[PDB]
Nucleic acid binder design. Sequence first.
DNA 1: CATCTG
DNA 2: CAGATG
Length: 327
Amino acid sequence: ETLNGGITDMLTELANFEKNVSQAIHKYNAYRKAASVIAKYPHKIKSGAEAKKLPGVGTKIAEKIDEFLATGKLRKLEKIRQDDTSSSINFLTRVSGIGPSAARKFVDEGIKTLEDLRKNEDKLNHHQRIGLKYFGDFEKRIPREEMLQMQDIVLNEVKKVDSEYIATVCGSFRRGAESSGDMDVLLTHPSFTSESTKQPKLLHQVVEQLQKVHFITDTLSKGETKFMGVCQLPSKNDEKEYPHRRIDIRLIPKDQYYCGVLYFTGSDIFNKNMRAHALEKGFTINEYTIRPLGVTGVAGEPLPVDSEKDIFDYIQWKYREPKDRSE
DNA sequence: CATCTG
DNA sequence: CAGATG
Ligand SMILES: [Mn+2]
Ligand SMILES: [Mn+2]
Ligand code: NA
Ligand code: NA
């Protein structure tokens, strides 16, 4: 957790670059288990050879830890923190809509910067276009004082469209958090479930409303159950308008809301421990459900939940307010 | 995993 | 449809 920090870190930068710049998925993948392993290792790695000793750790990495250990640096890492081509790919990639794949093409084509992007707004697809447009706003965190306003609005309109909706803003917003990155909303309706054959409007009616009143400003992606957009708090008495916010909306059949809802609320750490214990208590959990575990190895069968309360209950646990869902 | 693009 | 992004 700090006894093997640099090592795990350099390894990461290394790993990272493999996949993002080169295409070295294997390689990249190599750095990972490696940093993951040294990560757990109880001691102070004083040498390469000592490390090699670990699984996932071969010769080359060992060689690396050496030079790193031996000196406060690594050549190859030093060669990379410079290289303009590498730097560009990390940068371009910041644009929502631009992955690495794309990060590469652009650069090869000479687009390495934001200006480069605007100049060639044409090669950019819609999502990317927006991405470019709100680069700034996108990177800005979301102070909960805003969040509360957003939530206020979303909730009023969903309500208006149908009293039967059920919306929930999960995320860290949900877990207390002073500010979040984007707004995730869970959505269900009674008239939509596991079996129930579809009902797209269920999602669209609301999306519409939201833009009806201008909260939603753009659409990143709009499928029948998921919606990726942009929203924005009405700018008051003109002098101070709000940054544009990343927002997602998802239709979930009523019969699996809470597992979902529970799930989205994190934290990852709260998840696993919860899952780990579930396992003990004779169960299984995932994104959508909870199932009574057979002894034959495994087994399923959807245990019925009417709240986060039903779930915990199941695993015979202490109902955790969202705040304490931290770890 | 669900949506988009081409 | 494979392949990219989130
Ligand atoms: Mn988001
Ligand atoms: Mn979020
Ligand atoms: Na990106
Ligand atoms: Na292939």
